[PDB]
Design an enzyme around this catalytic site. Structure first.
Site, mmCIF file in Angstrom:
data_model
loop_
_atom_site.group_PDB
_atom_site.id
_atom_site.type_symbol
_atom_site.label_atom_id
_atom_site.label_comp_id
_atom_site.label_asym_id
_atom_site.label_seq_id
_atom_site.Cartn_x
_atom_site.Cartn_y
_atom_site.Cartn_z
ATOM 1 N N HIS A 196 -48.838 -10.094 -14.435
ATOM 2 C CA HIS A 196 -48.337 -9.485 -15.697
ATOM 3 C C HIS A 196 -47.570 -10.469 -16.549
ATOM 4 C CE1 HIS A 196 -49.658 -5.528 -14.641
ATOM 5 N NE2 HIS A 196 -48.644 -5.229 -13.761
ATOM 6 N N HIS A 231 -53.466 -4.211 -15.613
ATOM 7 C CA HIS A 231 -54.028 -3.718 -14.358
ATOM 8 C C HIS A 231 -55.515 -3.801 -14.333
ATOM 9 C CE1 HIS A 231 -50.081 -1.425 -13.697
ATOM 10 N NE2 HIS A 231 -50.083 -2.528 -12.916
ATOM 11 N N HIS A 237 -48.492 -9.992 -7.764
ATOM 12 C CA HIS A 237 -48.919 -8.995 -8.732
ATOM 13 C C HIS A 237 -48.133 -9.051 -10.026
ATOM 14 C CE1 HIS A 237 -50.565 -4.937 -9.927
ATOM 15 N NE2 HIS A 237 -49.318 -4.879 -10.544
ATOM 16 N N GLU A 238 -46.817 -8.999 -9.911
ATOM 17 C CA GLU A 238 -45.946 -8.924 -11.099
ATOM 18 C C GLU A 238 -46.102 -10.198 -11.940
ATOM 19 O OE1 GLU A 238 -44.678 -6.314 -12.192
ATOM 20 O OE2 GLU A 238 -45.163 -5.116 -10.348
HETATM 21 O O1 LIG Z 1 -45.103 -0.135 -8.996
HETATM 22 C C1 LIG Z 1 -46.252 -0.136 -8.549
HETATM 23 N N1 LIG Z 1 -47.063 0.960 -8.469
HETATM 24 C C2 LIG Z 1 -46.570 2.292 -8.753
HETATM 25 C C3 LIG Z 1 -46.447 2.558 -10.179
HETATM 26 C C4 LIG Z 1 -46.040 3.815 -10.595
HETATM 27 C C5 LIG Z 1 -45.918 4.014 -11.964
HETATM 28 N N2 LIG Z 1 -46.112 3.063 -12.914
HETATM 29 C C6 LIG Z 1 -46.505 1.854 -12.472
HETATM 30 C C7 LIG Z 1 -46.706 1.583 -11.126
HETATM 31 C C8 LIG Z 1 -46.817 -1.362 -7.964
HETATM 32 C C9 LIG Z 1 -47.796 -1.251 -7.010
HETATM 33 C C10 LIG Z 1 -48.289 -2.401 -6.429
HETATM 34 C C11 LIG Z 1 -47.784 -3.636 -6.840
HETATM 35 O O2 LIG Z 1 -48.197 -4.812 -6.293
HETATM 36 C C12 LIG Z 1 -49.345 -5.028 -5.555
HETATM 37 C C13 LIG Z 1 -50.589 -4.683 -6.050
HETATM 38 C C14 LIG Z 1 -51.740 -4.901 -5.347
HETATM 39 C C15 LIG Z 1 -51.586 -5.463 -4.092
HETATM 40 C C16 LIG Z 1 -52.719 -5.753 -3.328
HETATM 41 C C17 LIG Z 1 -53.677 -6.036 -2.683
HETATM 42 C C18 LIG Z 1 -54.894 -6.329 -1.928
HETATM 43 O O3 LIG Z 1 -55.749 -5.176 -1.981
HETATM 44 C C19 LIG Z 1 -54.479 -6.578 -0.473
HETATM 45 N N3 LIG Z 1 -55.187 -7.889 -0.154
HETATM 46 C C20 LIG Z 1 -56.647 -7.821 -0.327
HETATM 47 C C21 LIG Z 1 -56.961 -7.668 -1.854
HETATM 48 C C22 LIG Z 1 -55.660 -7.489 -2.585
HETATM 49 C C23 LIG Z 1 -54.848 -8.717 -2.417
HETATM 50 C C24 LIG Z 1 -54.617 -8.985 -0.943
HETATM 51 C C25 LIG Z 1 -50.343 -5.803 -3.560
HETATM 52 C C26 LIG Z 1 -49.184 -5.582 -4.299
HETATM 53 C C27 LIG Z 1 -46.802 -3.724 -7.803
HETATM 54 C C28 LIG Z 1 -46.294 -2.560 -8.375
HETATM 55 ZN ZN LIG Z 2 -48.609 -3.812 -12.201
#
Ligand SMILES: O=C(NCc1ccncc1)c1ccc(Oc2ccc(C#C[C@]3(O)CN4CCC3CC4)cc2)cc1
Ligand SMILES: [Zn+2]
Ligand SMILES: O=C(NCc1ccncc1)c1ccc(Oc2ccc(C#C[C@]3(O)CN4CCC3CC4)cc2)cc1
Ligand SMILES: [Ca+2]
Ligand SMILES: [Ca+2]
Ligand SMILES: [Ca+2]
Ligand SMILES: [Ca+2]
Ligand code: NA
Ligand code: NA
Ligand code: NA
Ligand SMILES: [Zn+2]
Ligand SMILES: [Zn+2]
Ligand SMILES: [Zn+2]
Lengths: 166, 167
Positions: A123, A129, A119-120
């Protein structure tokens, strides 16, 4: 006049990365494998190539930190923000920070580093997003438990809009 | 999917601001009027709208401070750097900081807060310094007390947000 120009995308196909430091939660080997497989996510569908440097400056500097860690975008302890990364460009551009107040894992007990890293790095490479709930770029963590990863089509189309296929 | 934009800009036209604290040099009312007018410099020539928040998290947090005040742009006492503002972005992006070792005024004396704040909010919105000595975004202070945004700044700001109601 002048605006603050952004780099939509890296103007070079060969990029370097450096793992500056390491989480307590996984072995050096597990972290190295998580990041290498996170880069392969994007290199598999584009002409991008990624090379690890051990020392000195690299395009994507990767580190683990907590709270205020040197960019005035502090982390917030366990939960909430997991990680962040800067878009393409010089200096902090491309760099990726992971909140070491989370528990990082090679599996499911905690946040799976590979998934979060892939994910990162989206970016780091110029993706924001997605609004598609099935996208890797969707800003909510999900872990399917499947041993194989497949990049969703939304992320494939977004990364290729920048760099084209490989 | 979404890619990042080509220029650092706000992706929304409705922005909020918060005056977090105030300079000794001027009344709260004078300060509020200066910032409100400084925002109107830019809303008048774009589709941007600005709303004041009294507390909590605004897009553009405005504060006065001296020396090290919590970022990589410490102030330096009287004159020199007068103020600075971060390009559009999350958290500190958009925020505007004013060096309270300057003398802020609502007249021709010291540094006119309105003028400096209108410059700083150009930065908050995504303009860097201009080379044009006639521009508001030129990084040298000049007092005027007549307000017309110079053409360089108009063209700059509209390249990012368009004109809004050409009125
Ligand atoms: O920090 C984060 N979120 C909270 C936030 C709060 C405030 N400001 C920004 C972010 C955040 C959240 C998630 C992050 O990484 C991720 C984001 C999406 C995924 C995913 C996924 C799937 O659904 C699972 N399988 C099937 C389809 C896809 C791919 C494989 C995994 C990690 C990375 C950062
Ligand atoms: Zn992100
Ligand atoms: O700090 C500053 N400069 C020093 C410095 C900058 C960067 N790094 C280090 C030091 C600085 C200087 C000026 C600042 O605000 C201002 C910049 C330009 C102006 C102006 C002007 C005019 O010529 C007068 N009328 C007619 C034409 C235009 C518009 C209205 C006013 C304030 C704001 C900050
Ligand atoms: Ca970098
Ligand atoms: Ca966290
Ligand atoms: Ca100063
Ligand atoms: Ca802000
Ligand atoms: Na940890
Ligand atoms: Na600036
Ligand atoms: Na003062
Ligand atoms: Zn960081
Ligand atoms: Zn500051
Ligand atoms: Zn300036």
């Amino acid at each position: 006049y002048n605006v603050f120009p952004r780099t939509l995308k890296w103007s070079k196909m060969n990029l370097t990365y450096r793992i500056v430091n390491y989480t307590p939660d996984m072995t050096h080997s597990e972290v190295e494998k998580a990041f290498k497989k996170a880069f392969k996510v994007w290199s598999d569908v584009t002409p991008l190539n990624f090379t690890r440097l051990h020392d000195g400056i690299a395009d994507i500097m990767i580190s683990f930190g907590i709270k205020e860690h040197g960019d005035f975008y502090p982390f917030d302890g366990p939960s909430g923000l997991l990680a962040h990364a800067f878009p393409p460009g010089p200096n902090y551009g491309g760099d990726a920070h992971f909140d070491d107040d989370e528990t990082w894992t090679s599996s499911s007990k905690g946040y799976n580093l590979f998934l979060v890293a892939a994910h990162e790095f989206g970016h780091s490479l110029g993706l924001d997003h997605s609004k598609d709930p099935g996208a890797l770029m969707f800003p909510i963590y999900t872990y399917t438990g499947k041993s194989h990863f497949m990049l969703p089509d939304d992320d494939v189309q977004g990364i290729q809009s920048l760099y084209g296929p490989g």
